[PDB]
Amino acid sequence: GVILYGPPGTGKTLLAKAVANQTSATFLRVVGSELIQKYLGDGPKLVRELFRVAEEHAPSIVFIDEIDAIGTKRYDSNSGGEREIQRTMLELLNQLDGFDSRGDVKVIMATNRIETLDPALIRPGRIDRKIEFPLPDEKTKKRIFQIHTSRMTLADDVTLDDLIMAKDDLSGADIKAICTEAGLMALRERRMKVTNEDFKKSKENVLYK
Amino acid sequence: YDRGVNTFSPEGRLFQVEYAIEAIKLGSTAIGIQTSEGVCLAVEKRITSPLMEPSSIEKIVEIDAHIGCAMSGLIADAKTLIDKARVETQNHWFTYNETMTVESVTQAVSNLALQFGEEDADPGAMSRPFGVALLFGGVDEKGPQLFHMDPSGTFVQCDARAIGSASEGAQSSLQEVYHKSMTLKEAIKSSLIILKQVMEEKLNATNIELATVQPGQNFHMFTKEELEEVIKDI
Amino acid sequence: DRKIEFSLPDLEGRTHIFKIHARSMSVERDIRFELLARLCPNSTGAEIRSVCTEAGMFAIRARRKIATEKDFLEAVNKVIKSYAKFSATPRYMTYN
Amino acid sequence: SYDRAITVFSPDGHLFQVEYAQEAVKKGSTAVGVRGRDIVVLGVEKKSVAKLQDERTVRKICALDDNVCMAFAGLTADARIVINRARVECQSHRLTVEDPVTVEYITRYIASLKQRYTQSNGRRPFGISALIVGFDFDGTPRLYQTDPSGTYHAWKANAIGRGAKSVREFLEKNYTDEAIETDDLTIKLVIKALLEVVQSGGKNIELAVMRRDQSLKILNPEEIEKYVAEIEKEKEENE
Amino acid sequence: SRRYDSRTTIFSPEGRLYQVEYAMEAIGHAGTCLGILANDGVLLAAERRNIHKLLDEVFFSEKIYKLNEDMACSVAGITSDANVLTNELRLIAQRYLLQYQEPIPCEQLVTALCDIKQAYTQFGGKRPFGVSLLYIGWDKHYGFQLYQSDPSGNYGGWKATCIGNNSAAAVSMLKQDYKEGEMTLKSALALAIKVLNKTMDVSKLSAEKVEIATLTRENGKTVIRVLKQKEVEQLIKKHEEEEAKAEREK
Amino acid sequence: NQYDNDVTVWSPQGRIHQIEYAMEAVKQGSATVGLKSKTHAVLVALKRAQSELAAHQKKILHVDNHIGISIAGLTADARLLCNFMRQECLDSRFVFDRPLPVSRLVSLIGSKTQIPTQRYGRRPYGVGLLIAGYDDMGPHIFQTCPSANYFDCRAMSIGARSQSARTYLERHMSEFMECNLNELVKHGLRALRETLPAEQDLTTKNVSIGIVGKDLEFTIYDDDDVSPFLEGLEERPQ
Amino acid sequence: TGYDLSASTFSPDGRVFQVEYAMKAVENSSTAIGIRCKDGVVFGVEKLVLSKLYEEGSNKRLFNVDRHVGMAVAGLLADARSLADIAREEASNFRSNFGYNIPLKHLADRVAMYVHAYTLYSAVRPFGCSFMLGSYSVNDGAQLYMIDPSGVSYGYWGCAIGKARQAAKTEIEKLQMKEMTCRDIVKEVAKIIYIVHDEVKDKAFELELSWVGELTNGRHEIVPKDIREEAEKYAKESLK
Amino acid sequence: SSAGFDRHITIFSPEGRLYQVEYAFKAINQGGLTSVAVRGKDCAVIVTQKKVPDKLLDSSTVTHLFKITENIGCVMTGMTADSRSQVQRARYEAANWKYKYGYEIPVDMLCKRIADISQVYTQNAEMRPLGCCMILIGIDEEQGPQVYKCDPAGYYCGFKATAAGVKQTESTSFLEKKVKKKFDWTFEQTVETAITCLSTVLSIDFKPSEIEVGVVTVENPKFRILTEAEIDAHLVALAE
Amino acid sequence: ERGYSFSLTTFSPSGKLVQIEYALAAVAGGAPSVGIKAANGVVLATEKKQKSILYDERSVHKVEPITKHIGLVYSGMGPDYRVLVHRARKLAQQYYLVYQEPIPTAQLVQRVASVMQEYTQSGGVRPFGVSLLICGWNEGRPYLFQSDPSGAYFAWKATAMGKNYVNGKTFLEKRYNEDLELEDAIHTAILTLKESFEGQMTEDNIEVGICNEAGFRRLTPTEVKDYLAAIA
């Protein structure tokens, strides 16, 4: 198994998408939040069904995304209390390595709060590789600005070195946010070229509110 | 899921003391042998980087003119125990004017082990029991004496002791090469054989340390010049 | 009627688990597993299985065909000491 | 009188608070220290200045005496109190035994204080790791490294703070007798080591050099430029 | 007794500690003040929070306190704790004058108070202090000085600083528009007015909604002044006029 | 089970569990026997050791000329109590110039060890003292327990697998009223021989004997002059 | 739940649970009776024979707190001993402070307040023994008092504590105790003890009797051996 | 309604309440007794009931009335031990006031000091707030008789006629209806009203061995306990 | 014995003191009260209402004079108000014993707020449950102050605290001004206390105190009866 953890918005889902892209096996996706339900004895049914259909097809890849959502929020529609969540977790925890031969299925899961979930869930034999995703560095920030402005018709007046030092610890998603917002605000006036003052107001719009 | 530091287990043993007993297994090995001729102590160092200064890290440290100590487990805290040992010996010499047996010093120290008390007094050496295991070697009027002391507060005289991470194997192998007609040189040689056999890395004249005490002279330890004599003569 | 209990392996347990989970390996013929048993004080059968796997992966990483002692030492250095902040056993020996 | 135990043994034999303090130190700014036959050099990086700070109130290198210097990684709240206690001890030393204080003595004193702070009640462990550099009497310049758990060592060269593994791996494969043959050689070695770490594009390095003669000699923002330029020229000619 | 404890001193598995973090999140809101220094005289601007129509408006000061003949400080956070700290440092300075018969340097006073503050997060099991405050002064060793404090205990010397709710924008815009050693007590004020304008969402910069304090050096006075409300509105309209000219020009 | 974490709490059945746990800890030690004749008291202890090349742990301690004790439990608390015993006996001798009678001392011990079982966050003392002494009223045998409770006895045995020895003592109870030291000690050893499995027994390196009497001060015999007592003993029937 | 942990928290229905647990701890002791006569009082204790090794006279459950006041206890022995010691110390302190034997109505109150101090704070636990005090004075008559863990002191013509409190007090009340002097009371007590604790529950036990009144110059002490011999011989006939 | 430790210690609930005090008030009713106090034109009267379930109990030592001072009397409701502790505290405080100031304590100040002492308990997190309620009657010069009441939460007040116990509400209703008559009051009227109020609330038609009465008058301020004979006289004269 | 030695009020994940807020919510449910001042003196009005006719309303008071010229009233919890009044009395005596001069009101308020705040950082306690209104007349200019369980203090021209206090604030805004008389002040205060008064208003259910540049006094029932008359 593989779990990917780190601060928010640094490309966990993106790497998942790319892996789905190149691969040849069937890819099954489900978000952790809708594992919970509104009746008794339903969550376990859902998990049994999911893994059954997964092994029904072929060598396949399952993606479980934002697991921590089950273990941090409470919703009134949930008829049971916090014990049914425990029941669901026991079922999922058995699916990976229970009394019966697994077959040919891989598992990939990701979260950004790894200090809340049950350590019994992570023991080797149910998940082996844990990969951590740190914040971008100045070299990577330069590469990121280079990538996200490919097909942009931009004027040489701008200096990216200003925006590299724009924030103390800006994350990866702020990059694409800045690019798209500035593009929108220049296209406001039916124009094709983007100037520097445009970024000067765009970063302020997106970073401060 | 939270209990005080003074709780008894459903089978009668304490909690903190058992955990410390399990914790002294993370330290380096150490072997001590007592012979009517004298007492010898040997220890490893676990050098990790070539920028180490091997002479900076030491294990055997003298307590007086005729008492030596070998330590295993954690190290940072043992300094307090060694200090109290030395101060007690000098206080006894000042008050009464003679030299003390290693046994009296051993129990005088051991009475200090069980003191952690969450409530009551002013600052105490509270919080936790100490995590070190000690070998005491001395020469008194009744010949050479070797004692072993443990985090629980129990001390006992032994003939061939091995403490540390690789304690079991050393103890198992040591029984078949000891008897009462032992001599110093062959004792040191056998000890070196055992250490090199259970070592992790390679053996040289800087990865180990020895010390010996005989009734004649005082506590004396070898340097990098007389240490390789037995290495080449293995 | 019976309350069989399974505890963490002692020492013959560790060397013997190594013998079992590594007997299908293409590795060096002159390495000793007892040192490997000594290097991991309280660990489960799972960790031994994962150590075998990760040493094989270190050998396949570069180019080699058969693994050696350095692979095992590095694998132990990483799956035992580097991952140890995601371990159950410090909170499942007080039985909760 | 808040009296309650804090650091308690774990079921398998660890001191979890000490592990947490070490993991806290492992996320501070990077510091490096090396010694030579006459001059000992220690430097720090990643200043991250916003051109509105007065450098005299942000510097993390302070002098315990006229012959001892500190560098540290961790959190900056506790450094001043540790340093102040150390200075008080140094001064109190001279009033008794006349001779100036040795560096190893101060290392033992600090280590013992930090350790005994883990046995009391209602006191969390300290979260700093420091390098103590000094040229004692008899001319034997030396550095010592301190740990939060309270274990001290005598080294030849160290790097603490963020990214210690890379800087070390650089050091053991590039430190030889010839590298410390000359003073400019040693300064070049340290500048090269720090440059192979966190970016710090020239303007984010602070160095300090002892020539075994007198007190602190902080180099102005001039020799850094010349050293960087000649390092670049040597790199260009070598390849 | 242990079943009811909260542990306001332990570390965390991730390395940091949570009490000061929560204190910082709370200190983030509730108030706005900033300080600027470029030449002889230093300025503090504070946005008033209690501005209802039913206030007596007395004591001459609500967030500006004298500490010595040349020491003044603002504050943000919980007010009562601020009273505690100000009273505590007052006799610190008085005892320094008692001991040495000489006005105290600023940095020593700041360091002493920071030690007092940090002692609470080292041990004792109490909640920390939720106060962030500034310091301005003059001394013979280094002339004019400005300083910022932090509930954790760390401090530093600065030239332009904001602590208010929208301090981020204040820092960004002070970064891009400043002059080294030229902004006398005539040009910095307009910049401060416009900065405060951008910080507060309410426009027109109500005269009663802001307060300004200035420190100047004099041979035997060391003048500390708080200019009245008959001279703020002229500054506001002067800024409005220059901005109107710049607006119409482009 | 939350009723099992501190001394102060009371279980619904009215049994504090800490004291039960301490008793259980006392049952962990090695066996030991004690008994009295008309004018002599004898206590016998069987030792233990870990590896064949380590010395045996000692059990019997010397308190005062007319008072000896035997210990089962963990040793640190044992020393902590013995120091108190020495201190009090010396104080009584210094002030009133007379041996301290055994019962008054035992009452002092009970009152002393009762205090921790009532405050908050204080553990009990884990020891199983057996007190043997001689006073103006003759011999005395007493037993204490971690629950700050003591009993007066004429023949008692404590430690792991002490039950069979207690049954043997109960069977041959009467004859202690006419025997002398020679056969008294032999009876004590016969009693102790039952608490061992079917492979190993007494070898003179695992036995320690303490005797006090009307005209003999409290004496300890161990590992040397013990052979005179042991020899002449009939073998275990099988 | 969790309302029964400490002795500082009220249950929702409005009562403290730890004290109730303590009283249930008392209700497993053996048994003790004390009754007042014309000119004195008589205690009576039955001591179970746990095993043959112990001696007679061991672990006395009757304590003579002062030269003229007797005490009988039921519960945990250690707590009983500690309370006995504090009562004795209080009596001596009072004699030294003022200079005459303390009356009951004051000594019982002092012990009761000291006990009640152990049911408020969470740093201590409540006691686990319930006891009886008796005495006689020539100028004051015969006094009997009973005290429980909660801290209540009451006066009785005659009472009983232990397992079979109800069964015993059934036959306590039949006797006409208002007049007949306590020389024939002793036979009644032996009879009333031998009619409880059937042989099925246990085989054998022993009996203790105490004595106080002007019949012995007001002092408090133990009964002679021949008297209890005669009383036991008499009570042997009541089984018919 | 609650979260955390509002149900275990005296800390504020999210809605502004606090429960560890509200529980003591219902802890009051555990004994199962009731008392009534009336203030007349120049007299003050208190009536209480006593219950003796068995003959073995000495009927002369269950009085709930206590004599604080030669001019001030108190009556008790609730648990027993806490009651005794509070009584002793009051006696000690009055004696200290006399030592310090040299003249008698007015009733109001004494009640204030005892209630203030109670108030600290509901401020910290170690103690229990003492579930037992207090009634005081006295005479003050230039003010006539005065009647005051003190509760566990610390709220003291001076009334004209009060009742404490299980049946507080209906008794207060009856007293209100009666006092609305707006007429003069004499000793016989006060005693008759106080008796008949409790009599009709419980509907017993009792005997002179079940009720205790305390009075004070402005002719002889010494608080006194009525003898059974004159109690019988009042009782039979009431029934026309 | 021994206390607990660790504070029970700690910062929440959003950085909000929970306990002091709950204390304020409890304060809001107390008896209403209002306070006014206009150029010649200060007036405090508050409402009291016993549950039944048996209570002797002549035995307790709400308005308590600290000294001859300082007045105090409260809104909220019952008992601890007395503790605070006692502490204020003590502080007044302590100050007068140094400078031989009556305390200015501002200093008294500062000290009282100091105590109230200090009480929330100590060990094993919970804060008070009261809101205080302080009035005084020193150096000609009258003064009014209002404290708070958090310890912050303000100066108000006229305010209202208790049930439905927001409506009292709005009404006072729509009526209060800067130049008036003491008598008109009393009338308008009584009127605003009648906004949500009980079933009927009598002379004993309202407590009013005044303080002019001549001193602080509590008004007897006669003048309360007269003022309630010729009103409403």
Ligand SMILES: Nc1ncnc2c1ncn2[C@@H]1O[C@H](COP(=O)(O)OP(=O)(O)OP(=O)(O)O)[C@@H](O)[C@H]1O
């Ligand atoms: N290293 C990177 N290279 C390119 N794009 C990046 C990088 N890091 C972040 N991004 C951009 O940031 C966006 C946010 O990443 P993503 O949506 O995968 O978030 P995430 O890491 O799963 O976190 P979260 O749980 O907060 O959604 C990506 O769509 C991508 O455009």
Ligand SMILES: [Mg+2]
């Ligand atoms: Mg995502």
